[PDB]
Design a protein around this ligand. Structure first.
Ligand SMILES: Cc1cc2nc3c(=O)[nH]c(=O)nc-3n(C[C@H](O)[C@H](O)[C@H](O)COP(=O)(O)OP(=O)(O)OC[C@H]3O[C@@H](n4cnc5c(N)ncnc54)[C@H](O)[C@@H]3O)c2cc1C
Ligand SMILES: Cc1cc2nc3c(=O)[nH]c(=O)nc-3n(C[C@H](O)[C@H](O)[C@H](O)COP(=O)(O)OP(=O)(O)OC[C@H]3O[C@@H](n4cnc5c(N)ncnc54)[C@H](O)[C@@H]3O)c2cc1C
Ligand SMILES: O=C(O)c1cc2occc2[nH]1
Ligand SMILES: O=C(O)c1cc2occc2[nH]1
Lengths: 327, 327
């Protein structure tokens, strides 16, 4: 049993990891190799601030599975090398809207008192809550090391095709190709959703602030997310846009929006800045297909890959076990 | 006159700025575009620690042009913006060797003394001199800034060939594709010299230390070049290895190597870790070739492209002014 996971963001490495935790004891030899053309810190996953938060329905179970999972680890000392921690903060809107499904997964969820709404002249409604953050860059790095302990080998290649990989002699292929899955098997329902962010030095920001606006659309209005080192600013989401390139208006839009939202930001040193492509699909593709060869796809996580990736991996891992059960 | 520059490393952006800096006041209009599929922080450039030093005809001159031009700007306000500063430290050898030809270009060149030579107890000899560091990341940003205020537009684009660009409307194509040059036109002299590095936190390190040993060969023994915010630990050179993926054996090699050079780094926290491809050629190809259309080649700067970039950039400008005349 010779497995090739293609892809090395959060999705591809969790999966590999899950599959190894659960299966290596049960065969005989389990050989897993990962193929990506990009490793940290050059993946979409390296540009996510990594806040846990879904969109405003197995996907709910999955996110939640990942929340209970990370949380059960936040007060361990692996947590640091994971870049895992807890953070509170605001969601802000113009109009009233219903509580989300994750109401009760996050900690201490509630509506904002008028006095807390007094500080954001521009918003009429909000939530406060405690969530948690997984920095992509460290996460990816921790995953890397845990894989490398479990003797899992990496290779840098662009895979042109699944046949490429079956002919080398994979029995099982796991496609974790994020936004790039179309290149391998066509997907009219996968589109990139271009994001941009800046990293600024603002170590007094201890809260996340996310704003929402119906005309702007999802992930397209100011947000501010404190990290371990820098505070992440962003609020760019443009469907169908494949330019891996920082752009000047986006920079401004981010800067003006973020400073307006939080004037104190005006003196924060810009540290760096980056673009990525959220794998937008109306729904994560997470499912088996036969080629003689077996394929588990697991892409189309859009703007919530960190939030969900571990229910996905545990789910990809039952698919892997359902296969062997047919052998 | 339609001008297209391929590459956003120090070479392309350099030559670009420098071409525009010289001929914007004569044509009428000079329309300049940059096409690259990779920009900061994913070029080979953002990988260099950026320390000025050639090996041990024309390139000699180009290096000293680059070094003088950086010295003329070392005490200016934009040095910080540029990521440029003075640094001294050591070159350590097993045997005596001839003085290098840039002896008089760097400042205060000298032979190490007995007391100094007692500090590296594996090395019978070397030099101390004062040099400068031009930090790879900061520099490209600075350059993108100059080019952008200047109206040079950038596009994210893997160019599949010269004609495709030719057929758009380009009069001059400037070829700055580093190690990939050979994909646009076969060049069997040009090869990868993979290096890996780590960036550590050791801000008590105020000197560079280059070691050398022909029995490992070029860039293939330990080195410690301090930067603005961290210190680069290196010593890896692999001819023909095309794996962009940090390697654990190479990690150990650099780690063990430097902590032996400089025992003090065993307590240094590891910040990050990068692989790049040095465009290794027996010389820089910087020459004209007509394909119809005009092509200036500027690529193959091995492991001293920041050391030499302004010179080559000056020479590529020149070649450009000559193309005008003919037209
Ligand atoms: C600006 C921005 C902010 C974000 N913030 C958050 C956040 O706060 N919280 C959260 O939960 N999510 C966030 N996300 C969403 C999240 O970052 C992504 O949904 C998720 O990382 C995608 O993971 P992936 O592993 O599927 O893709 P990637 O990390 O992009 O990895 C896909 C891998 O597949 C490889 N690959 C593709 N094609 C091939 C090929 N043919 N051959 C070999 N390898 C191939 C690629 O090299 C890469 O290694 C954000 C996204 C963006 C853009
Ligand atoms: C570990 C390491 C340390 C180094 N340290 C130093 C140092 O201290 N001092 C020093 O002087 N030098 C150092 N160097 C050498 C230096 O990094 C290189 O000489 C220099 O970066 C080369 O710059 P570039 O413009 O040639 O190529 P690159 O940085 O690689 O830029 C090439 C560009 O062209 C693009 N491209 C290529 N083909 C196409 C195409 N078909 N279509 C569109 N775009 C294309 C790429 O995406 C990229 O943007 C170091 C190198 C390494 C690997
Ligand atoms: O811009 C984004 O993709 C984004 C920001 C953010 O905060 C929590 C989840 C999330 N996604
Ligand atoms: O590793 C390299 O390629 C490299 C190291 C170094 O120190 C001065 C120039 C230079 N290049």
């Amino acid at each position: 049993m010779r497995v090739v996971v293609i892809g090395a963001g959060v999705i591809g490495l969790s999966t590999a990891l899950c599959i190894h935790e659960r299966y290596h004891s049960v065969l005989q030899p389990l050989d897993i190799k990962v193929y990506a053309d990009r490793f940290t810190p050059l993946t979409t996953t390296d540009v996510a601030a990594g806040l846990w938060q879904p969109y405003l329905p197995q996907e709910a179970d999955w996110s939640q599975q990942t929340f209970d999972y990370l949380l059960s680890h936040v007060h361990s000392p692996n947590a640091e090398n994971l870049g895992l921690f807890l953070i509170s903060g605001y969601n802000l809107f113009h109009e009233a809207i219903p509580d989300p499904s994750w109401k009760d997964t996050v900690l201490g969820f509630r509506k904002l008192t008028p006095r807390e709404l007094d500080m954001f002249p521009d918003y009429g409604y909000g939530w406060f809550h405690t969530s948690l953050i997984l920095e992509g860059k460290n996460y990816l790095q921790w995953l890397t090391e845990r894989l490398t302990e479990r003797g899992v080998k990496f290779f840098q290649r662009k895979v042109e095709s699944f046949e490429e990989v079956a002919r080398e002699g994979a029995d099982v292929i796991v496609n974790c190709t994020g936004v790039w899955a179309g290149a391998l098997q066509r997907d009219p329902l996968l589109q990139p959703g271009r994001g941009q962010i800046m990293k600024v030095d603002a170590p007094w920001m201890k809260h996340f602030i996310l704003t929402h606006d119906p005309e702007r659309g999802i992930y397209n209005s100011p947000y501010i997310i404190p990290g371990t080192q820098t505070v992440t600013l962003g609020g760019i989401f443009q469907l169908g846009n494949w330019s891996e390139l920082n752009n000047i208006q986006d920079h401004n839009t981010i800067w003006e929006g973020c400073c307006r939202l939080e004037p104190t930001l005006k003196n924060a040193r810009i540290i760096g800045e980056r673009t990525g492509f959220r794998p937008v699909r109306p729904q994560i593709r997470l499912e088996r297909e036969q080629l003689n060869t077996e394929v588990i796809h697991n892409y189309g996580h859009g703007g919530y890959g960190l939030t969900i990736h571990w229910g996905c991996a545990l789910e990809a891992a039952k698919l892997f076990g359902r296969i062997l059960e047919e052998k």
